[PDB]
Write a protein that binds this DNA or RNA. Structure first.
Ligand SMILES: [Mg+2]
Ligand SMILES: [Mg+2]
Ligand SMILES: [Mg+2]
Ligand SMILES: [Mg+2]
Ligand SMILES: [Mg+2]
Ligand SMILES: [Mg+2]
Ligand SMILES: [Mg+2]
Ligand SMILES: [Mg+2]
Ligand SMILES: [Mg+2]
Ligand SMILES: [Mg+2]
Ligand SMILES: [Mg+2]
Ligand SMILES: [Mg+2]
Ligand SMILES: [Mg+2]
Ligand SMILES: [Mg+2]
Ligand SMILES: [Mg+2]
Ligand SMILES: [Mg+2]
Ligand SMILES: [Mg+2]
Ligand SMILES: [Mg+2]
Ligand SMILES: [Mg+2]
Ligand SMILES: [Mg+2]
Ligand SMILES: [Mg+2]
Ligand SMILES: [Mg+2]
Ligand SMILES: [Mg+2]
Ligand SMILES: [Mg+2]
Ligand SMILES: [Mg+2]
Ligand SMILES: [Mg+2]
Ligand SMILES: [Mg+2]
Ligand SMILES: [Mg+2]
Ligand SMILES: [Mg+2]
Ligand SMILES: [Mg+2]
Ligand SMILES: [Mg+2]
Ligand SMILES: [Mg+2]
Lengths: 197, 167, 106, 127, 61
RNA sequence: GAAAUUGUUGAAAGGGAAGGGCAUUUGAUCAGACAUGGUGUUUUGUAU
RNA sequence: GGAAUACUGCCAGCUGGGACUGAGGACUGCGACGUAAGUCAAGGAUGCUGGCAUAAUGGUUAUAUGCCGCCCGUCUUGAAA
RNA sequence: AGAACUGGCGAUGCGGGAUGAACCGAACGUAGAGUUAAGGUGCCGGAAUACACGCUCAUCAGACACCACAAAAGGUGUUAG
RNA sequence: GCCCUGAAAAUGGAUGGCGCUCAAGCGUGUUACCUAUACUCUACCGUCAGGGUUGAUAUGAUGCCCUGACGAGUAGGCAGGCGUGGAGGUCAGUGACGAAGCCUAGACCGUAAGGUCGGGUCGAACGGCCUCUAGUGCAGAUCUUGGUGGUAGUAGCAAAUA
RNA sequence: UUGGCGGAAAGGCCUUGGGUGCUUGCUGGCGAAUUGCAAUGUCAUUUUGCGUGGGGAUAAAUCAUUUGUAUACGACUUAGA
C-alpha cells in the first residue's frame, strides 16, 4: 500500500519476521528494517550462543577466506536468516534482495518516518508467557560485534529528540481536538454524523 | 514435367452451410438498469463521468446523456457492460426519447483514400440535445447536490474496494 | 480531482506451478484489498492490462499493453488465476498490473 | 482468391533437430533417432528435446496447404502451367529453379492470362 | 491406463483383397464383392473368400 | 573451390564452463491476404 | 402437550456470476409449443458492432527472465561415473 | 549366499520420497478445459503463520513408511493412570 | 506418555535449506486449498475393427464416406515411406538468355527421412514419373587416408674456458 | 526572505515577513459533443548528447632517464627546468 514500508524490528522474532519480509520482497514491496539489535530469537541466550558457535566452526578447510562468512552484526544476522528464505542465486532473488535495507538503530533517513510492526512475528503475541528468549544485540556482542555502545548512545540521542517532537505533536493534537469539539453540535456535524462521519 | 500430375483434383464448388438453429431472442438487461438511473462510465473518452440513462436501444446499447449542460457528455450510446448502475435515480417521464434509435447515430463510413495526414456537428443533434437536457435539468434541480454530483467525476481512492463498495 | 484511477491495482506473483515445473500459460495475480475467495469471486471475468514502456515508438506511442482476464480464484487468500493473450514475460514477477471494472455486473 | 478452408493449425512448428547436432559439427541437424541404451532423449527424460511422432500430424483438410490456402505445383513450361487451368482456387504454380529468365517471362504472362497464382514471380527478374 | 484383456491393434488374420495382381481376378472380386454386399446369399460371400485364397489353399479339382 | 581451422569488419552476450527444453518480453528480419463477379456506366482509348 | 430447528436425503424446483470449446456443412431423425399456419434452445454458432489493413497479429532468429535439462556410444543386474 | 508365490526393475518416462533402477501414485499419440492420486500448504515453493483438544523446553530438543540406526538400565523433570 | 542421562572419530555441514518453541515439534480430529503424461468431456493425428457406396457426369472401388475402441517399450519381428550410383520406358522434360556443384541466424511443404523456392558464386550438363538393379545412407570401430586445431609464440635453442 | 535546529548515511525539519496565483466555504453565467459502443489511449523519472546565454577555474599522470631502503618480470621507493 506504501512505496517503502519501514519495520521496527524491536520485539520481533527473527525467523517469523524474515519469512514475512522475504515474501513481501518477492512480491515487490520495498522494505527497510530498523533497530535490528532489538530483534528476538526464541530460546535461551546460551542455546543461541551455542548455535552460533556451531555455525562459526564451519569454514572451508583449505582456505578460510572462501568459506561460509560469519557476519557478526545483528542486521547481517537478520540478513542471513532472510537470504536463506530467498532464492538468492537467481536474478529474481537478487532483485528481491536489493529491494531491502537492514539497519542497526534508526538512521537519519528513517528516524523521521513512520515505523510499523508485523503482529504475526511479534514476540509478545507469539511466544507463550514464560518462555525464555534472546536479544540479538547481546548475542552479536558476545560473538564479536563491536558497535553495541555507540548504537545505544545514538539511540538515546534520537529518543530525546523524538520525545521533544512528540510533546509538540500532542499539544497541537489537543488544540485540534478542542477546535473540532467546539465546532461539533452544528448542522454540518449532525449531517455528517447521520451519514456516518 | 517437373512435377508429374495429381490423379484426382478436388472440386472447386463451395458447399452451402447447414441450416443453423440460433434464433435471436432479445437481450435481458440486468435489474439495476432502469431508465432514469445515474451511471458511472467505466471506459471511453468520458470514463469516470456520471450520466443519466434514458432508453434501451435496439442493438443492445444504452442511450445516455450527461446532460451536456452539466458535465459535457452529449446524447450518446454506451455498452451496458461498461457502466456501473448506481442507486441514484431521477424521473425521466417527460422526455421525447423515441426519436433516437440505431440509425440516428450513423457514422458515414470513411473511404480508404481519405487518409488524414494531419487532420462539423449536426444542428439537428445540438437542438435535440438542448430539448432533452432542458427537460432533464428541470428534474435534476429538485434534489440538492445532484447537479454537482453529476458534474464531478468518479475515481477510486486509496483503500476503496469495489467488491465492498455500494453504488 | 488529483486521482483518476478507474482500475484496481494488482501484482503479478508467479506462473501456475507444481514444486519444480511451471505452466506459463496461467499467471497468478494478487489483487489488493481481496483476502478471501468469496471476495475474489467479484473480479472473475474482469479485464487485466499489464502496461509497460519501450524505447522504440511503434504506432504513435512508447507505451505497450498485454491484455488478459481473471478466470478463477486460487487458494484460500484471494489470489486469482489470470490468462493473457500472450503469456506474461516472467521478469514481471512482482510487477504491478491493472484490473478494470469492466465487464460490469453492478 | 483461394478456396475457403479452416484455420491452419501447425501442431509443432519448431524443427526437430538431431541430438548433439549443436554439440558437434560432424553431427548434422537432419533428424535421426537415438538408439543408445542410456540415451536420455530416447528414454524421454524431462527437459530434453522432443521427438517426431504421429500425433504431430497435420489436419488432413489443411495438410499441404500454403498460408494463402493453395497447394504448390512445380511447373517447367506453359504446358505444365495449363494443367492448373480449372484448379486456380486450389493450386498455385511455382516455376522450377532451373527455368531461364526468358522462359519465366512467358510462363508469367500465360499465368496472368489464365488467372493462376504464381508463388515466385520475382525469380531471375531484371530491373 | 487400461487393463487390456486382449491384444491391441491386432489384424483380423484373414486375407481380404487377394495378393495376386491379376487384373481379371480383380475384376472378378469386384463383381463378387458387389454381389456379396447386396444379395444376402451365403454363396457369394463363400466364393469371394475363396477368390482371395492362395495357391496351396486352392488345390485342383 | 566444401569443412575443420584463421584474419578483418559488423551485431550481440558474458560474477567458477558452454550448449539445450517450454513460455513470453525486447531488438533485428520476413512471407501471406488485400484486386474480388457486382447494381453500375458519375466514363475516357467508346466498346474499353 | 403442541410446535420449531438441526442433521441426512429427494425434486423430470427457480435463478445470478466465471472459464474453455464452436467439431460438422443442402434436406432427411427424434421431439417440444400451437386448432392450424408455422415456430423452436429439437442429429455440433450465429447475430450485431468497432479498430487496423500494416510488420499491427504472426513466423524466424539473437538475447533476457522463470522453472527444468549430467556425455554420447558400449558391455552390464546396475553408467554422469 | 540359496529356494517358494506374487508384483516389479531390466525394457519406463511422468507426479511424490531433496537426491536415488526397484518404494508410493500412476504407466506415456498431439492439444484445451475440469477434477484428482501419492505427497503437501511459514519462506525458499503452487497451496490455511487454518480450526480444535492436549503433551514437550533439550548447556547433543524434535520433525514422517522403504531410509540412511540406537539398547539394557535410570530420573520428586513434567503428565495421566 | 513426552523430555533428559546412558550417547566416543577423525576436511566444515546438513529434519533438503533457512529457520521454528501455546511450533513451522509430538499424538489426534475436522474442513478448505495446491497439482501428474492418471480420470471426465472436446478437437486433431495414426492404428485396428465393423459397416455404407458401381448409378448417371469426371476422374482415383487399393476411391469416397459412416461408427466404435485403442496408442509405453530394449533385444527382436513386420509394414509403409525418404535419399544415392547405374539400367529399360516416357514427359517431342530443364539448360550457355546459365546445367551440375557450393554458400545463405531469407521463404514454403512434410510427424519425419526429406522436398521445394529466392539470392550469391559458377561454368556444361541434369531432372519428374512408371519400372529394373546394387560396391546404396556413418559419430563412434586405440577405424583408413588426407587435412587442421588447442596446447603455444609455450618447452626450449645452457657440454667442448672467449 | 529572516532566524534557527539536525553529522548515524546530517542533504532534512521548523520558523519571520512581504509578493503573487488558486480556493469547491456559499450563489451565478458560458464552454465541452465526432476518440463515433471499449482499446494504457500516452500526463512518470533515469541517463546521455548537441545548441544557445550567463557565471567560474587555468592541471597532472605515464613512458623514457635516475635511485637501491625495492625487485624474477611487472610492481615499489627516490631524483631530475
Ligand atoms: Mg553439428
Ligand atoms: Mg538401460
Ligand atoms: Mg581455383
Ligand atoms: Mg569455414
Ligand atoms: Mg438440507
Ligand atoms: Mg516480428
Ligand atoms: Mg508477436
Ligand atoms: Mg521475437
Ligand atoms: Mg541461445
Ligand atoms: Mg534459459
Ligand atoms: Mg537442475
Ligand atoms: Mg559388474
Ligand atoms: Mg541386458
Ligand atoms: Mg515403472
Ligand atoms: Mg506461496
Ligand atoms: Mg515419568
Ligand atoms: Mg535421545
Ligand atoms: Mg514443511
Ligand atoms: Mg498435527
Ligand atoms: Mg492439466
Ligand atoms: Mg474398413
Ligand atoms: Mg491411452
Ligand atoms: Mg556402382
Ligand atoms: Mg546454377
Ligand atoms: Mg551457416
Ligand atoms: Mg568448359
Ligand atoms: Mg559399402
Ligand atoms: Mg567421419
Ligand atoms: Mg554408432
Ligand atoms: Mg581416431
Ligand atoms: Mg622459452
Ligand atoms: Mg638445455
Amino acid at each position: 500500500v506504501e512505496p517503502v514500508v519501514v519495520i521496527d524490528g524491536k520485539g520481533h522474532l527473527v525467523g517469523r519476521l524474515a519469512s514475512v519480509v522475504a515474501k513481501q520482497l518477492l512480491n515487490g514491496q520495498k522494505i527497510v528494517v530498523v533497530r535490528a539489535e532489538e530483534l528476538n530469537i526464541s530460546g535461551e541466550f546460551f542455546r543461541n550462543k551455542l548455535k552460533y558457535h556451531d555455525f562459526l566452526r564451519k569454514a572451508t578447510a583449505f582456505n578460510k577466506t572462501r568459506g561460509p562468512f560469519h557476519f557478526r552484526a545483528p542486521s547481517r544476522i537478520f540478513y542471513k536468516a532472510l537470504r536463506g528464505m530467498v532464492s538468492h542465486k537467481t536474478a529474481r532473488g537478487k532483485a528481491a534482495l536489493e529491494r531491502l535495507k537492514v539497519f542497526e538503530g534508526i538512521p537519519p533517513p528513517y528516524d523521521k518516518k513512520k515505523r510499523v510492526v508485523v503482529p504475526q512475528a511479534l514476540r509478545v503475541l507469539r511466544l507463550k508467557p514464560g518462555r525464555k528468549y534472546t536479544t540479538l544485540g547481546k548475542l552479536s556482542t558476545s560473538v564479536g560485534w563491536k558497535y553495541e555502545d555507540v548504537v545505544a548512545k545514538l539511540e538515546a540521542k534520537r529518543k530525546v529528540s523524538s520525545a521533544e517532537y512528540y510533546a509538540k505533536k500532542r499539544a497541537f493534537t489537543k488544540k485540534v481536538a478542542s477546535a473540532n469539539a467546539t465546532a461539533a453540535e452544528s448542522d454540518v456535524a449532525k449531517q455528517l454524523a447521520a451519514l456516518g462521519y | 514435367t517437373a512435377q508429374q500430375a495429381p490423379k484426382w483434383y478436388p472440386s472447386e464448388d463451395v458447399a452451402a452451410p447447414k441450416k443453423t438453429r440460433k434464433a435471436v431472442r432479445p437481450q435481458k438487461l440486468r435489474a439495476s438498469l432502469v431508465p432514469g438511473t445515474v451511471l458511472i462510465l467505466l471506459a471511453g473518452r468520458f470514463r469516470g463521468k456520471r450520466v443519466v440513462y434514458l432508453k434501451h436501444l435496439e442493438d443492445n446499447t444504452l442511450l445516455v446523456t450527461g446532460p451536456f449542460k452539466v458535465n459535457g457528455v452529449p446524447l450518446r450510446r454506451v455498452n451496458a457492460r461498461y457502466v456501473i448502475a448506481t442507486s441514484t435515480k431521477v424521473s425521466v417521464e417527460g422526455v421525447n426519447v423515441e426519436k433516437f434509435n440505431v440509425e440516428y447515430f450513423a457514422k458515414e463510413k470513411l473511404t480508404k483514400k481519405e487518409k488524414k495526414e494531419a487532420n462539423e456537428i449536426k444542428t439537428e443533434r445540438v437542438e435535440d440535445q438542448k430539448v432533452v437536457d432542458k427537460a432533464l435539468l428541470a428534474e435534476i434541480k429538485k434534489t440538492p447536490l445532484l447537479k454537482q454530483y453529476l458534474s464531478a467525476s468518479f475515481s477510486l481512492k486509496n483503500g476503496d474496494k469495489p467488491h465492498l463498495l455500494k453504488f | 480531482a488529483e486521482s483518476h484511477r478507474l482500475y484496481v491495482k494488482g501484482k503479478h506473483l508467479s506462473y501456475q506451478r507444481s514444486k519444480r515445473v511451471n505452466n506459463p500459460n496461467v499467471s497468478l495475480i494478487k489483487i489488493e484489498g481481496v483476502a478471501t475467495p468469496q471476495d475474489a469471486q467479484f473480479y472473475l471475468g474482469k479485464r487485466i492490462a499489464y502496461v509497460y514502456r519501450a524505447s522504440k515508438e511503434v504506432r504513435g506511442s512508447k507505451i505497450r499493453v498485454m491484455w488478459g482476464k481473471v478466470t478463477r480464484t486460487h487458494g484460500n487468500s484471494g489470489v486469482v488465476r489470470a490468462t493473457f493473450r500472450n503469456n506474461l514475460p516472467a521478469k514481471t514477477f512482482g510487477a504491478s498490473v491493472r484490473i478494470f471494472l469492466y465487464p460490469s455486473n453492478i | 482468391a483461394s478456396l475457403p478452408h479452416p484455420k491452419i493449425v501447425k501442431k509443432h512448428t519448431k524443427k526437430f533437430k538431431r541430438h548433439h547436432s549443436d554439440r558437434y559439427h560432424r553431427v548434422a541437424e537432419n533428424w535421426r533417432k537415438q538408439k543408445g541404451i542410456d540415451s536420455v532423449v530416447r528414454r524421454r527424460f524431462r527437459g530434453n528435446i522432443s521427438q517426431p511422432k504421429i500425433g504431430y500430424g497435420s489436419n488432413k483438410k489443411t495438410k499441404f496447404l500454403s498460408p494463402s490456402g493453395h497447394k504448390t505445383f512445380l511447373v517447367a513450361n506453359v504446358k505444365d502451367l495449363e494443367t492448373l487451368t480449372m484448379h486456380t482456387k486450389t493450386y498455385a504454380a511455382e516455376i522450377a529453379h532451373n527455368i531461364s529468365a526468358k522462359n519465366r517471362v512467358v510462363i508469367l504472362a500465360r499465368a496472368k492470362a489464365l488467372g493462376i497464382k504464381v508463388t515466385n514471380p520475382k525469380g531471375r527478374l531484371a530491373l | 491406463g487400461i487393463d487390456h484383456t486382449s491384444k491391441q491393434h491386432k489384424r483380423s488374420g484373414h486375407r481380404t483383397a487377394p495378393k495376386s495382381d491379376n487384373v481379371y481376378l480383380k475384376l472378378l472380386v469386384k463383381l463378387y464383392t458387389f454381389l456379396a454386399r447386396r444379395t444376402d446369399a451365403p454363396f457369394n460371400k463363400v466364393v469371394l473368400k475363396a477368390l482371395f485364397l492362395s495357391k496351396i489353399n486352392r488345390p485342383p479339382v
